[PDB]
Amino acid sequence: ATVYLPPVPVSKVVSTDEYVARTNIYYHAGTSRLLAVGHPYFPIKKPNNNKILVPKVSGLQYRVFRIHLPDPNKFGFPDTSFYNPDTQRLVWACVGVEVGRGQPLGVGISGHPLLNKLDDTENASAYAANAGVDNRECISMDYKQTQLCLIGCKPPIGEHWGKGSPCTQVAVQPGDCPPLELINTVIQDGDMVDTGFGAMDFTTLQANKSEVPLDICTSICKYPDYIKMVSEPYGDSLFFYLRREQMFVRHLFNRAGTVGENVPDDLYIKGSGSTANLASSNYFPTPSGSMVTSDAQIFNKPYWLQRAQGHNNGICWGNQLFVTVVDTTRSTNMSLCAAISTSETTYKNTNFKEYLRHGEEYDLQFIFQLCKITLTADVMTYIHSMNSTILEDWNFGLQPPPGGTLEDTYRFVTSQAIACQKHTPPAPKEDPLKKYTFWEVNLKEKFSADLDQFPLGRKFLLQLGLKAKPKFTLGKRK
Amino acid sequence: WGKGSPCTQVAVQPGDCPPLELINTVIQDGDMVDTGFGAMDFTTLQANKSEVP
Secondary structure (H helix, E strand, C coil): CCCCCCCCCCCCCCCCCCCEEEEEEEEEEECCCEEEEEECCCCEECCCCCCEEECECCCCECEEEEEECCCHHHCCCCCCCCCCCCCEEEEEEEEEEEEECCCCCCCCCEEEEEEECCCECCCCCCCCCCCCCCCEEEEEECCCEEEEEEEECCCCEEEEEECCCCCCCCCCCECECCCCEEEEEECCCCCEECCCCCCEECCCCCCCCCCCCHHHHCCEEEEECHHHHHHCCCCCCCCEEEEEEECCEEEEECCCCCCCCCCCCCCCCCCCHHHCCCCCCCCEEEECCCCCCCCCCCCCEEECCCCCCCCCCCCCCCCEEEEEEEECCCCCEEEEEECCCCCCCCCCCCCCEEEEEEEEEEEEEEEEEEEEEECCHHHHHHHHHHHCHHHHHHCCCCCCCCCCCCCCCCCCCCCCCCCCCCCCCCCCCCCCCCCCCCEEEECCCCCCCCCCCCHHHHHHHHHCCCCCCCCCCCCCCC | CEECCCCCCCCCECCECCCEECCCCCCCCCCCCCCCCCCCCCCCCECCCCCCC
């Protein structure tokens, strides 16, 4: 059809490793032990202060580790022999990772003493109420078994449903369904996972705001928006992911609440009674995650991240790693109580006062192969267009002007005065990376070279240097 | 997970959940496998001592 495009491009955005050469230098690193021990159901604030007493630590929450890295230039040089800051600049490629997650079993679990339910609609022996009071009961549920992992080098964008423009044109407003508008925004640490009831804010979307667990009520729930994140031709929001999840129907329930929206009335033959009316329609699945299978996991397995998708193919940009882990499969919840006295032979609510905690273990190990990027002036021309501040941070591709004069005017407002001057107003604010909540991970000083002392080093060699030294052991172990 | 020393965050007190503090020690003969509330002492942590078998 007539006559499109035919295309004149005429400049083209290129892949970033076609002039990149690897180096055989290997640095190892790894964390001491990541541990957070919190409350699974809800956060506990102190009863006399604003701040937390026990935070919320559940595996049904996004665990976002913000890994901040230096550059190799800003770090070690073994030997100088082909390295000139002129000819090339150096960049980290983390070529292997281990995500540790060996801990005891438990489940992620949430619940609400005011969880809505009319009757049971998996099967029913009677005819449900037209409206009624106090049809809500203490029910608890997990949202679904959720394993996901994704690794990137820029903050990762999730989708959620926000409260859009209430229409007067489509007549979408409260007293009828609220509006839903799909808004992308960045996912956080302590951001909630998808509830099986859509991934959405429920703070302004729920005007009862006791329909569901309270932890999601106040927070935004998000689903990783995979399709937009790989649409990006740079591919630095993410470059690996996998997931495993399970949700089957534990039982259908009906939400108490009747619609104030129209129902056609040619779809049922009117009866006699209140069976010449339709009762509640607002049916929901209740999620399930009953069967734990700790034989299958997407964890306790290294992630060999030797290359990346996109124009990026194993170069950290922004010198960042963003890793999002949700794991509900082995996430231990523990039970204990404190006694008021063991002399009292009761087991009241104020005697032995029951409790539950959650203990959450992860561990991160790295191995970093060195790389170099040859820079010619045309290569620099693209890299500044890609983000000038790479060239700045390295401090090659910045040599000068700019600028840097003039002038200071004066002469003279000493005396007088206009007023007076003043100087000079320097924040807000760096940094734009940290403008969102994260499990802060400094990695800038744990760089090594050992590979036979870390077990991660030994498994790496088993793939690579060949080396390890292997069996391991084998043959036969079942 | 052992019984911990009292912290600000969580202390060994009525009205307040005890801290869980990690004790590593060698596997005894006849030591139990997990419960599904994990590896912990329950002798001390469960004051009531009637929550689990």
